[PDB]
Amino acid sequence: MKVKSKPLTLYNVSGDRITADVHFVESFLPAPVVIYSHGFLGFKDWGFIPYVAERFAENGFVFVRFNFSHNGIGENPITEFDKLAKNTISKQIEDLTAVIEYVFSDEFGVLNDGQLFLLGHSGGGGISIIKAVEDERVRALALWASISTFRRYSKHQIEELEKNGYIFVRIQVKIEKIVYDDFVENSERYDIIKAISKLKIPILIVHGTADAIVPLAEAEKLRNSNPEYTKLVLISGANHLFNVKHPMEHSTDQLDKAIDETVLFFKKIIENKKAD
């Protein structure tokens, strides 16, 4: 079977340009749409994202990946450090909103069944939970190593932010104060734990037991806030990136379990809708 890959250029309401791709296998259409969101420090063409896109397409999904309008990608698919420094949670949400609206627009030329499922990794999981609350057209959510709070900054980092106007985060990237200001001035709207408790759609929480970036405790906090609609799946010995190396030359047991658990979870939702 041939996995087709098509480039998309879309804009958010501020006119910020978003570059995206859609992977699909024609023989599976009409199929559900899966929008994948990565964290602040991630890129659609890096790590396991291309392989994940290929696998979801091979499993009967219309998989969309995108880069944030302010994630620094300008000419090479980092050349825009001014914009990356100002990639607030509000801009990331605005970008995800434009991708969802592009998929639901007449401009999306990929024959689908109208079902929108979100998949978020790390920071992208947080952005996906907020978005799922804001838009009831998201009928299922899967989270891979997702954060449980946007309040990631330490006592020290916040202190340098208020003194210098920016901080560096590891290859160091400058994050301007506006990113912290945007979370704090919108902490209720962006309260991940509160948002996930409001959801009434199936939620899959995939997390590794050897994850040192976002501990297993955070995955259990997400599950604890909505025990009715969530399912917690533990990947034994998996780190924050499902044990994949960079450059990615092959997949791991860990990443294949996350993909299969997600595919089956999404597939049971489609099958249950047909049963009604």
* DSSP 8-class letter at 137: T
Method: X-ray
Which residues fall within 8 angstroms of residue 87, CB to CB, at 6 or more apart? 40, 68, 70, 71, 179
- What are the beta bridge partners of residue 263? none
Superfamily for domain range 3-275: Alpha/Beta hydrolase fold, catalytic domain (3.40.50.1820)
Q: Where are the alpha helices (DSSP H) in 118-252?
A: 123-134, 155-164, 178-184, 192-198, 216-225
- The pair of three-digit structure tokens given for residue 139, joined into one six-digit string: 């009928």
Counting Cβ atoms within 10 Å, is residue 51 exposed (0-12), middle (13-18) or buried (19+)? middle
Query: Which one, of 201, 251, 203, 248, lies nearest residue 224 by Cα?
Result: 203
* DSSP 8-class letter at 174: E
Residue bearing tokens 């309040």 = 151
DSSP letters along 102-118, please? HHTSTT--S-EEEEEEE
What is the residue type of 36?
Y
Distance of CA 252 to the CA centre of its chain: 20
Task: Phi first, then psi: give them for residue 28, nearest 5 degrees.
Answer: -95, -10
Distance of CA 257 to the CA centre of its chain: 18
Q: How far apart are CA 237 and CA 188, in angstroms?
A: 34
The upper half-sphere exposure of residue 32, i.e. CA atoms within 13 Å in the direction of its Cβ, equals 25
Query: Which one, of 97, 202, 99, 227, lies nearest residue 143 by Cα?
Result: 202
Neighbour count for residue 203 (Cβ, 10 Å)? 25
3-state SS assignment for residue 275: helix
* DSSP 8-class letter at 125: H
Neighbour count for residue 204 (Cβ, 10 Å)? 22
Sign of CA dihedral 2, 252, 123, 236: positive
Query: Which one, of 18, 244, 206, lies nearest residue 122 by Cα?
Result: 206
3-state SS assignment for residue 196: helix
Q: CA-CA distances (angstroms) from residue 84 to 13, 53, 97?
A: 18, 24, 19
